[PDB]
Design a binder for this molecule. Structure first.
Ligand SMILES: COc1ccn2c(C(C)=O)cc(C(=O)Nc3cc([C@H](C)O)cc(-c4cnn(C5CC5)c4)c3F)c2c1
Ligand SMILES: COc1ccn2c(C(C)=O)cc(C(=O)Nc3cc([C@H](C)O)cc(-c4cnn(C5CC5)c4)c3F)c2c1
Lengths: 115, 115
């Protein structure tokens, strides 16, 4: 099933905007992880394929998604990376769970409406 | 009194490194405040001269300080900006306070040793 870029942007962007409006929980996800700046030099030993909101947003704006599951996969990639790297008790881990909750609620209706 | 740039770097850089060493607490100060990315588009209504650890670091590394009190003033400019802009109860405000404690302790003997 193939979709047009503007169609996916209009359908999917509101679910991404919903993640951005979570404060302070979106803040760890707004730009790409920068290991040197963050003092976490082992980041890419654990995480092989980085992902973040700014990257997902660019892909939606530049027509790089053809099918809604490609977008959903990037969103889950971002969350799975943060769950993998960070300890269960850390502030980033919990912020991640909060965003994933918000995502699960926002994405389901949109996915049913697309078919 | 004229100070050699390499002399100021060697003497003062340990005081900056001590701030960087504060693990969660240095994080809001490691790069310049980015109002669009952080979702705080009034920042520059309130904060007239932004300052942060990476700017202070680059100025020490490239010899932009003529005397020790210019360094010290940038460090307070950073803390005062954060104290001013953010609420008394906010995470950033309280991280600022921990950094400025660490700075108050470290800076006394170094400023004696230069004069
Ligand atoms: C210090 O150890 C870690 C370990 C993992 N991460 C990650 C990820 C996504 O894993 C993200 C970060 C990380 O600190 N991201 C980050 C980035 C930025 C801005 C957009 O540049 C702000 C925050 C942030 C978090 N809370 N706050 C509010 C107190 C002000 C800001 C942030 F966590 C991080 C830090
Ligand atoms: C959400 O509203 C505000 C309002 C003011 N600031 C300020 C300053 C300096 O005023 C700094 C930030 C800010 O979030 N900075 C920032 C940047 C980055 C990385 C280095 O890019 C990480 C953090 C950060 C804070 N806590 N954490 C740990 C949870 C992981 C990361 C951060 F707060 C901030 C956010």
């Amino acid at each position: 099933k193939i979709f047009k870029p503007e169609e996916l942007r209009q359908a999917l962007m509101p679910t991404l905007e919903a993640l951005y409006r979570q404060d302070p929980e979106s803040l760890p996800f707004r730009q790409p992880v920068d290991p040197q700046l963050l003092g976490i030099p082992d980041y890419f030993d654990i995480v092989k394929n980085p992902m973040d909101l700014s990257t997902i947003k660019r892909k939606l704006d530049t027509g790089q998604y053809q099918e809604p599951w490609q977008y959903v996969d990037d969103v889950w990639l971002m969350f799975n990376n943060a769950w993998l790297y960070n300890r269960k008790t850390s502030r980033v881990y919990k912020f991640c769970s909060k965003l994933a909750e918000v995502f699960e609620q926002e994405i389901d209706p949109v996915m049913q409406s697309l078919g």
